[PDB]
Enzyme design. Structure first.
Site, short mmCIF file in Angstrom:
data_model
loop_
_atom_site.label_atom_id
_atom_site.label_comp_id
_atom_site.label_asym_id
_atom_site.label_seq_id
_atom_site.Cartn_x
_atom_site.Cartn_y
_atom_site.Cartn_z
N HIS C 120 0.46 33.37 -49.38
CA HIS C 120 0.84 31.98 -49.64
C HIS C 120 2.33 31.82 -49.85
CE1 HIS C 120 1.35 32.60 -54.04
NE2 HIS C 120 0.36 33.47 -53.89
N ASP C 121 2.90 30.80 -49.23
CA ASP C 121 4.32 30.44 -49.47
C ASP C 121 5.36 31.41 -48.87
OD1 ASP C 121 3.70 28.08 -51.40
OD2 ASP C 121 2.76 29.79 -52.41
N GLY C 138 2.52 36.98 -51.23
CA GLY C 138 3.02 35.61 -51.38
C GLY C 138 4.50 35.54 -51.71
#
Lengths: 259, 259, 259
Positions: C120-121, C138
């Site tokens: 994520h991200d 992430g």
């Protein structure tokens, strides 16, 4: 036997009547699958796949998928050759070759555990095991009864000899000699694969003759060339030992050193 | 609630009415799934799976698949026992047990990240996390609130204590003691899992009592046996510390040493 | 072109006419896919996915799946932004962002090999490669032409500079400087990515100017701060070198040390 109604099998694909194909599996053209083979669900068998008898493909296994090589011409009919009695576990992935005269080749009775990977142009013999999440890079050659642990990187163009073992968290850069165990990063031969050898029914005499060959090669304070010479000059050797000598002689990249 | 028309669910499988099963998922016989459980797409739930309440299975998760043990008799009805509130991410794979009296067991509120693997006959308690691509070999035991990083090999028959952490690129060969962090290859206890302990709401007094137990065991220039004796002879101990002592006493393989 | 009848495509999803979607693939709502994109079988494209032109998604790839972050509110419409000409191999998995103003972002011509993972991200630029089974945690940032090997752990919030390489079995904890190769655990800069630089058509003068910048920074017996000062005070520098200096200056976590 039984092809599930939801399976998508190209009409040109050649399947023996006994072949079982499970739900939502995809088989492409230019495929041949021989007697006794079972394909579970969500399996993909790609064009160029030539599969023998009594193989098992578990859910989500993908066979003959494009090489992970950016320079490869995807238009070419390249191949994946698989023998008999192999097991391909869940989400294992076997990549096809990069040339028309260069298939990815797997022999007999090999076991590919869940999520293991065989790169383009690998050649594997018989009875090898790749454990869970094991990755073999392209152009790697395994003999027979070799054992590849997870968390192992093997350099392209390396050979792994018969009955050898690569332990987890190892980086292999040169050949792995037969009957041996390689470990660490950077990796070394740490000892003999005594378990593989005992499990295989090697006699105490045969195992001791293998130990003696490596004592000369590794533990005698001489160069590898000197040691191989010494061994050949020592008289009539058993096949296993002749093989050790030949493996060292034939090595392209050179053979991994001893700890 | 809703089973997608394309799902293939054996009529003998026992599913609570509220159970949601997504597209192209396969559920076999000898399966029981309890209230609140959601199965996404392409999931496979194998015979012998016994699943509790409010579990989530993400796309391509495979549950109760055959043990990756060559000597296992595939004819046996062996089991996978899963409790409540667990999350199984995409392509995670949980293998069933090898004996009729030896299931693979998972408790409550565990999180299995994408492509993580639980080997045959593992026992996990509650609230454990296996990160992305994490692999647990067969016969590994986790307590509660343990943290398993990717790129970790754990030896069969190892126990991982409560609130412990195994960091990435580690080879675990002996037990991982509770409240501790293990790292490296070969691995050692490198310190305490202070984050896990703070996150868990352990009081400063409780955390300092844990630190004091390990100072005696690891940082006092005496044998482990001597140290455990010293601790027991020192008076009334808190439960967390009693547990530390008992974990060391009950260890089958022995406990990982300190850096 | 052709959407297979068995594909499950939300009516609200926006697909260019030329978009090919294969068998048993799932596309959710709040998805946009641009011209020339091919999706194979069993692929899942999740809500929030915004995909450009001429992308390829191989069998079982999963795009925009929930973040593997326990504190994330699953109700939020967060996004996965993918540019043009990217390749997502079999069972690769790209996770969406954790905030409405924080997508997971991938630029152009990136290659994600089988079973690779983007947390994520993450922000990736152009022409990057993650090899087989490669995992990016992430909040990791890649520039352009970076190379991520399998068996690599990168710490959250690390930046990987342009044309850099992280070799297998490495633990990355600080930034990876541009044009460089990082290896080992704990990891260090071991040298320059000369292959990436030659393959990219860097002139001998440009490569030698890069080598000279790092000689000052790493091999001159002075602190990093002192070295960057020396470089800036030495006159007119090429862009590649200005970039090196700026990368070091802008580093949040600090930059990985040299072997």
């Amino acid at each position: 036997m039984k092809i599930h109604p939801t399976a998508i099998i190209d009409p040109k694909a050649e399947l023996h009547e006994s072949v079982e194909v499970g739900p939502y599996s995809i088989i492409e053209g230019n495929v041949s699958i021989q007697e006794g083979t079972i394909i579970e669900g969500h399996v993909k068998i790609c064009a160029g796949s030539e599969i023998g008898k009594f193989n098992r493909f578990h859910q989500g296994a993908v066979i003959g998928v494009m090489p992970q090589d950016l320079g490869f011409n995807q238009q070419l009919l390249t191949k994946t050759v698989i023998g008999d009695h192999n097991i391909f576990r869940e989400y294992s992935n076997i990549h096809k070759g990069t040339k028309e005269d260069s298939p990815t080749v797997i022999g007999n009775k090999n076991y590919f555990m869940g999520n293991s990977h065989v790169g383009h142009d690998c050649i594997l013999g018989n009875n090898n095991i790749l454990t869970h999440g094991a990755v073999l890079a392209g152009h790697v050659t395994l003999g027979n009864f070799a054992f590849i642990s997870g968390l192992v990187a093997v350099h392209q163009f390396c050979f792994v000899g018969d009955y050898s073992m690569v332990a987890g968290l190892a980086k292999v850069v040169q050949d792995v000699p037969p009957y041996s165990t390689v470990d660490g990063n950077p990796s070394t031969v740490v000892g003999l694969n005594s378990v593989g050898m005992k499990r295989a029914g090697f006699s105490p005499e045969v195992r001791n003759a293998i130990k003696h060959a490596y004592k000369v090669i590794y533990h005698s304070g001489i160069s590898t060339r000197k040691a191989l010479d010494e061994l050949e000059a020592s008289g009539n050797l058993i096949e296993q030992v002749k093989y050790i000598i030949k493996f060292f002689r034939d090595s392209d990249r050179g053979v991994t050193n001893h700890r």
